[PDB]
Every structure is written in C-alpha cells, then in structure tokens.
C-alpha cells in the first residue's frame, strides 16, 4: 500500500527535485490568478 | 501503389472498379462486431450504470456503427490489395527482362560438424 508520504514525492512541483530551478512555485488548482493590483485604475485631472 | 495513376482520386469507396465481391459474414467482420459489443460494455463503466451486460439497450447502436463502418473499411482493404497485386503482375508481363527463372540444380553445400 502507498501512503501520503509516497504521494508527496510525486506531488506537483518538479517531479524530479530541482538542481538549479527550485524557485518556481506550483500552479493553482483551476487556473492561477496573477496580479490583482499593479494597475493605474481611473485617471486624475487638474 | 501510393499515388494514383489509373484510379480516380478521392473516392467514397472505389466506384471506378466495383467488381470484387465483398466478404459475407467474415471472421474479420465478427471481430469488429465484437468490439462494437465491447464498446457497449465499457460505456457503463464511465457513466455508472447497473450491469455492463444486462444494462441499457442502447448497445445496438454501438454494434451497428462498428459493423456499418467496418464493412466499408474492409471493402477498401480488399480493393487496395487487389490494385497492389494488379500493378505487380502487369510490371512482370510488360518488362519480362527484370524477372528471371531458375529450376533444377545439383549444387554443393557446406556441411556442419557436431
């Protein structure tokens, strides 16, 4: 039988533990949401 | 032959040459008909329905579709193998020099020990 510890080895990350690229995080369950902010939103005039 | 020379391009079945006679109740047709019944068994595994064998009677659609398409598919099989042989025999008859005949010999061969 395979336990939860065995499932964590094949968990969503890199399949193969990373050598150099390990900073890349796992993607979301149903399409990732990116940046909510970092936008202008409504103009101002004098 | 891959490229058409005598046969008409883009055909529904053949239509240019019809005389060949398709197989009737063939063992090849029975296996495709078995797969039509087999597709009507594993469909109840996807959508969870009581009994694979004694379940829904929409299985008749699955058997008929495999037979109808399979009969047309095997008709092309008998046609294409006939054309392949027809061009092969015509190549020997027209050229003659390419083919060579040899019969009756008395040649020595090396015998193995132990």
């Amino acid at each position: 039988q395979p336990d939860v510890e065995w499932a964590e080895q094949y968990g969503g990350a890199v399949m193969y533990p990373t050598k150099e690229t390990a900073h890349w995080k796992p993607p979301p369950w149903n399409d990732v949401d990116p940046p909510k902010d970092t936008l202008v939103s409504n103009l101002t005039l004098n | 032959x891959x490229x058409x020379x005598x046969x008409x391009x883009x055909x529904x079945x053949x239509x240019x040459x019809x005389x060949x006679x398709x197989x009737x109740x063939x063992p090849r047709l029975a296996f495709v008909g078995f797969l039509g019944y087999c597709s009507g068994l594993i469909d109840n595994a996807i959508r969870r329905r009581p009994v694979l064998l004694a379940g829904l009677h929409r299985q008749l659609l699955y058997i008929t579709s495999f037979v109808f398409v399979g009969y047309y598919l095997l008709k092309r099989q008998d046609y294409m193998y006939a054309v392949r042989d027809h061009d092969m025999f015509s190549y020997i008859k027209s050229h003659x020099x390419x083919x060579x005949x040899x019969x009756x010999x008395x040649x020595x061969x090396x015998x193995x020990x132990x």
């Binding site: 890199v14 399949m15 193969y16 050598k19 150099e20 690229t21 900073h23 890349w24 | -």
Partner: protein
C-alpha cells in the same frame, strides 16, 4: 559479489546513467523563452555547416 551485484549490474548500469541523462533535459533550462530561442540559433548552423546538405 556476482549473483546479486555484478551479474545484476547490466540494467541498473543503464538506469543510474539513464536517470543522469534524464535530469539533463527536465531540470535543465529553468523556464525562459529567451533560453529556448538561443538554442534555435545553433540548430540552423548545424544543418548548414556541421551537416553537409546545401
């Protein structure tokens, strides 16, 4: 020595070296469209200079 290690060492020999060759393709090139397009520059030069065809 033999019946468990050395006579076995034919297929584990082509697993330990196979996984090393496997890691040089999957974990290699940490994303970036930049890096994949830098490799395409070489591929055209291989077909023109390194391989004699036109």
């Amino acid at each position: 020595l033999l019946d468990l290690i050395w006579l076995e060492a034919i297929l584990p020999k082509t697993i330990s070296l196979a996984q090393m060759k496997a890691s040089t393709l999957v974990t290699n090139q940490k994303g970036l469209i930049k890096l994949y397009f830098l490799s395409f520059l070489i591929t055209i030069l291989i077909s023109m200079i390194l391989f004699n065809f036109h």
